[PDB]
């Protein structure tokens, strides 16, 4: 049972089995309310909901009158982070009998999609209600579920409408990783590596050295036996550094830019290759190009760059828009430089039309304590595959 | 030039003419940015935008590269506080070339509708951008534009989705009142009276006295300017106070909702023919009658509440001939009213909360109070 603090509070609980025997109980005592709304997708729900309903009803029995638990199953996939889905969950909540009010405690059970969506619904529901995060994916456990950033996508782009709404509790249950598909697991490692690359060379070395052991466990269909503590240590280091940065610059006045390393170009790449290609994968290619950019600017050494590539490759992450696997999945989708530039214009870190990108000067230490303005011409160079 | 502080910042500026010769200049210096988005409705825009464009372009000529001013005209009326209009403005802001980014400074020019809408758009645009309020209606100047509450409506109700996003600046230009329709002016008085009724008997008395002078001018505020302004400011000052003490409404901010528990219920039915302040007027009477039925408020204060509302030309009953005509085909049954109050945002679970006054100028508690649904049924018919 490990606890991390963020923005002055110990909202993060990390352990194995939290879902089966801790969440329900904790919600009733620390998140007192008459109404609990659980949001997930048809896949995750069918596998983890039954267990929870009984754990909830068993903890609610003591309370009199017993609070209610309402479950909403959204379609799986990126398609659900939409205005439509936000509105559907909202109407559903309001039309309940009785309607869900401001005491409502929302529960986000799923990955970044469910998390981003659910968190956003909570921030604006009657101008804001409490919510908790229950990340079921590695990426969610090491990144998305922490920090309060929420959002949905629009036809014009990804994460353009949203809000920073901090969850009251963050339940990181490593047991969810037991059933997480190999690809998804690899996807999340992209964020783990990113987090280390901007904080400490020691942690990054740990990821390089742990690669094989981690991967073998992920590739063995049996699950993290003699590597548990190693897995928890890598996850926690990631979660701890984010909590640190978010605590110092919650609404991104500067420092929080760093968490976006590899995302300036990554998001551009993603807006094109999605949904066939995943977020972490895009961010992987993104870290390589942004690392190559820091090189083209005499900020980052050529050695660190190659090392960045070696680590991403070691965990099975693409490091080029030319990756054989990426092409087969996208049916050939081409990422034209002009398209990648147009998409980057919508990057949220931009100061006016000045494109800002996180630049590393060395593994473990950023160039500045924020993104850096970069001429559009210097960006064009690393965008050509 | 009066300045009021709220939440530790001197964001509120109050004066006559701010629009014509202060906003533009102030935005450029204190709200530095490359992009300015102005939102209004087709009516207000056509009358006040031309003036501003030139004042802006005249203040921008210095800065280089030149900062831009983008104008978006939304349809007038409550119909615009919708998910659709929120989406449209956002897509329009994201579609600009270059796209409006996180440095964007949004300008809400209009009443509560534009204000609530625009403020809400700013709060979630790329997770939040700055915005300023330029209230053109009395109600907006004395209430809506202050405090950060924003929202849009849904088919199921009013102000159900929204956010508390504080504006960087609040420009109260009394000159806008020069062209404000009599009805609209009366509408806003409903909030002025409410604010006094929950803060000071002294202020409420002054409102009782200025009743005729104010009305004669409304039915252009020459030898009464300082009277009007003093009334406006007292209202704005008390709200800033309450919002400072309880921003996200964890208690004391409930009081600003006096008359709104039943008021909003009434409104959800009679809207859009009947206005917000008017509904809140009837609402204040019933909630005052409720405090009486509970032995909290004296029968004298209630009647006095009625006299003041009537004096300013505000309805004090669902029967009121004026409301009747205006809404020929609409009734307010105890049932529909009750179903509507279920959606009140102050309700602690199924417990319906309502602000109770024990006397003009002093609330029963420092928050709304739970009230049995049966005690609410009584005053919901009159
Ligand atoms: O500040 C954050 O928490 C992030 O930068 C937030 C981004 C999403 P954003 O670029 O839409 O802010 C996420 O992809 C990244 O992994 C971490
Ligand atoms: O807190 C506020 O500013 C208000 O209570 C907010 C309400 C709107 P709400 O009931 O939708 O919050 C407004 O009508 C009232 O006059 C003042
Ligand atoms: Cl929204
Ligand atoms: Zn990411
Ligand atoms: Zn009101």
Q: A200: which DSSP letter?
A: -
A173, A198: one domain: no
Mention every residue, 6+ apart, whose C-beta is less than 8 A from residue A244: none
**Could B128 and A164 be called an inter-chain contact, meaning their C-beta atoms sit closer than 8 Å?**
yes
Burial pattern A89-119, b for ≥16 Cβ within 10 A else e, equals bbeebbeeeebbbbbbbbbbbbbbbbbbbbb
Q: Min CA distance, B345 vs chain A (Å)?
A: 6
CATH code of the domain in which A223 resides? 1.20.1090.10
Q: Which domain holds residue A99?
A: 1-179
> Measuring CA to CA, which residue among A172, A169, A170 is closest to residue A30?
A169
A214, A154: one domain: no
**Could B127 and A164 be called an inter-chain contact, meaning their C-beta atoms sit closer than 8 Å?**
yes
CATH code of the domain in which A73 resides? 3.40.50.1970
Q: Which two tokens stand for residue B221?
A: 């505020």
What span, in angstroms and rounded, lies between the C-alpha atoms of A193 and A238? 8
Show the DSSP H helices in chain A as ranges.
Answer: 18-21, 23-30, 42-60, 83-94, 112-124, 138-139, 182-197, 201-219, 228-248, 263-273, 279-296, 302-314, 324-330, 337-344, 376-383
Q: What does each C-alpha distance from B107 to A162, A339, A366, B122, B133 come to in angstroms? A: 20, 31, 36, 9, 6
A81, A160: one domain: yes
What share of residues in chain B are helix, strand, coil (percent, to 5)? Answer: 50, 20, 30
In chain B, the number of structural domains is 2
**Conformational region of residue A252, where left means phi above 0, alpha means psi within -120 to 50, and beta covers everything else:** left
What span, in angstroms and rounded, lies between the C-alpha atoms of A17 and A39? 20
Mention every residue, 6+ apart, whose C-beta is less than 8 A from residue B333: none
A314, A372: one domain: yes
What span, in angstroms and rounded, lies between the C-alpha atoms of A153 and B90? 12
B145, B207: one domain: no
User: Using alpha carbons only, what angle is made at residue A129 by residues A50 and B85, rounded to the nearest 5 degrees?
Assistant: 110
Experimental technique: X-ray
Contacts from B335-338 at CB under 8 Å and sequence distance 24+?
Answer: B336/B269, B337/B262, B337/B265, B337/B266, B337/B269, B337/B380, B338/B265, B338/B373, B338/B376, B338/B377, B338/B380
Cis status, amide bond into B167, omega within 30 of 0: no
B35, B122: one domain: yes
Burial pattern A317-335, b for ≥16 Cβ within 10 A else e, equals bbbebebeebeebbeeeeb
A157, A289: one domain: no
Is B15 in contact with B2 (CB distance < 8 Å)?
yes
B315, B337: one domain: yes
A338, A273: one domain: yes
Q: Of B157, B179, B201, which closes a domain?
A: B179
Strands B35-41 and B68-74: parallel
Q: Which ligand is nearest to the CA of A160?
A: 1
What span, in angstroms and rounded, lies between the C-alpha atoms of A131 and A129? 7
If you measure from the C-alpha of residue A151 to the centroid of ligand 2, how many angstroms do you get, rounded to a whole number?
Answer: 26
Q: How many Cβ atoms sit within 10 Å of the Cβ of residue B87? A: 15
- Resolution to one decimal, Å: 2.5
Residue A252 annotated to the active site: yes
Q: How many Cβ atoms sit within 10 Å of the Cβ of residue B143? A: 26
Which atom of ligand 2 lies at the shortest distance from residue A127's CA? 12
Give chain B positions within 8 Å (CB) of A353.
34, 98
For residues B313, B317, B319, B320, the Cα torsion angle rounded to the nearest 10 degrees is 0
Residue B293 annotated to the active site: no
Name every protein residue with a CB atom under 6 angstroms from any ligand 1 atom: A 143, 147, 149, 159, 191, 256, 259-260, 263, 348
Q: State whether residue B366 is helix, strand or coil.
A: coil
Q: Of A160, A179, A198, which closes a domain?
A: A179
Torsion over CA: B247, B116, B144, B160 (sign):
negative
B63, B90: one domain: yes
- State the DSSP H helix or E strand holding residue A101, giving kind and residue range, or none if neither: none
Q: What does each C-alpha distance from A290 to A303, A307, A337, A385 come to in angstroms? A: 14, 14, 14, 13
What span, in angstroms and rounded, lies between the C-alpha atoms of B272 and B153? 12
If you measure from the C-alpha of residue A260 to the centroid of ligand 1, how many angstroms do you get, rounded to a whole number?
Answer: 5
Q: Which residue of B has its CA nearest to A90?
A: B161
What span, in angstroms and rounded, lies between the C-alpha atoms of B302 and B281? 13
Sheet of A68-74: strands edge to edge?
Answer: A2-6, A9-15, A169-173, A130-135, A105-110, A35-41, A68-74
Q: Min CA distance, A126 vs chain B (Å)?
A: 5
Which atom of ligand 2 lies at the shortest distance from residue B194's CA? 16
A233, A129: one domain: no
Residue carrying the six token digits 């909901």:
A49
A328, A225: one domain: yes
Q: State whether residue B361 is helix, strand or coil.
A: coil
Residue among B191, B260, B271 to mutate when testing ligand 2 (max atoms within 8 A of CB): B260
Contacts from B78-83 at CB under 8 Å and sequence distance 24+?
Answer: B78/B113, B78/B153, B78/B271, B78/B272, B79/B272, B80/B41, B80/B113, B80/B114, B80/B117, B81/B113, B81/B116, B81/B117, B81/B151, B81/B152, B81/B153, B82/B152, B82/B153, B83/A83, B83/A87, B83/B152, B83/B154, B83/B161
**Could A94 and B248 be called an inter-chain contact, meaning their C-beta atoms sit closer than 8 Å?**
no
Q: Which residue of A has its CA nearest to B159?
A: A126
Could you list the beta-strand ranges (E) of chain B: 2-6, 9-15, 35-41, 68-74, 105-110, 130-135, 149-154, 157-164, 169-173, 353-354, 357-359, 362-363, 369-370
Q: A4: which DSSP letter?
A: E
Residue carrying the six token digits 């050529």:
A302
Is B136 in contact with B107 (CB distance < 8 Å)?
no
Is B260 in contact with B280 (CB distance < 8 Å)?
yes
What share of residues in chain A are helix, strand, coil (percent, to 5)? Answer: 50, 20, 30
Burial pattern B191-219, b for ≥16 Cβ within 10 A else e, equals bbbbbbbbbbeebbebbbebbeebbebbe
Residue among B149, B349, B350 minimizing CB distance to A127? B149
Q: Of A127, A156, A179, which closes a domain?
A: A179
CB contact, 8 Å: B162 with chain A? Answer: yes
Phi then psi for A81, rounded to 5 degrees? -80, 75
Is A112 in contact with A121 (CB distance < 8 Å)?
no
Q: How many Cβ atoms sit within 10 Å of the Cβ of residue A77? A: 12
**Could A163 and B345 be called an inter-chain contact, meaning their C-beta atoms sit closer than 8 Å?**
no
């Amino acid at each position: 049972p490990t606890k991390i603090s963020i923005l002055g509070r110990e909202s993060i609980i990390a352990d194995f089995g939290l879902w089966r025997n801790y969440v329900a109980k904790d919600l009733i005592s620390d998140c007192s309310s008459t109404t609990y709304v659980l949001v997930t997708d048809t896949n995750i729900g069918s596998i983890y909901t039954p267990s929870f309903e009984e754990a909830f009803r068993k903890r609610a029995a003591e309370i009199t009158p017993s609070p209610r638990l309402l479950i909403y199953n959204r379609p799986p996939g990126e398609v659900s982070k939409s205005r439509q889905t936000k509105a559907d969950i909202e109407d559903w909540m309001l039309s309940q009998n009785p309607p869900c009010g401001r005491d409502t405690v929302v529960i986000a059970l799923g990955g970044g999609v469910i998390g981003d969506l659910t968190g956003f619904v909570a921030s604006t529901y009657m101008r804001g209600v409490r919510y908790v995060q229950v990340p079921t994916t590695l990426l969610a456990m090491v990144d998305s579920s922490i920090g309060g950033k929420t959002a949905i996508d629009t036809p014009l782009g990804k994460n353009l409408i949203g809000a920073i709404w901090q969850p009251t509790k963050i339940y990181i249950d490593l047991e969810f990783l037991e059933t997480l598909p190999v690809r998804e697991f690899i996807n999340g490692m992209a964020e783990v590596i990113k987090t280390a690359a901007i904080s400490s060379e020691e942690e990054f070395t740990a990821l390089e050295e742990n690669a094989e052991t981690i991967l073998k466990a992920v590739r063995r269909e049996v699950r993290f036996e003699g590597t548990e503590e190693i897995l928890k240590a890598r996850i926690l280091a990631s979660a701890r550094h984010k909590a640190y940065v978010v605590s110092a610059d919650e609404r991104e006045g500067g420092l929080r830019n760093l968490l976006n390393w590899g995302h300036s170009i990554g998001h551009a790449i993603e807006a094109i290759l999605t949904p066939q290609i995943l977020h972490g994968e895009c961010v992987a290619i993104g870290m390589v190009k942004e690392a190559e950019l820091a090189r083209h600017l005499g900020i980052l050494k050529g050695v660190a760059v190659s090392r960045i590539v070696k680590c991403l490759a070691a965990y099975g992450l693409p490091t080029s828009l030319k990756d054989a696997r990426i092409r087969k999945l996208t049916a050939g989708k081409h990422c034209s430089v002009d398209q990648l530039m147009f998409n980057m214009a919508l990057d949220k870190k931009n100061d006016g039309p000045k494109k800002k990108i996180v630049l590393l000067s060395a593994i473990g230490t950023p160039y500045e304590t924020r993104a850096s303005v970069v001429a559009n011409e210097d960006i064009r160079v690393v965008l050509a595959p």
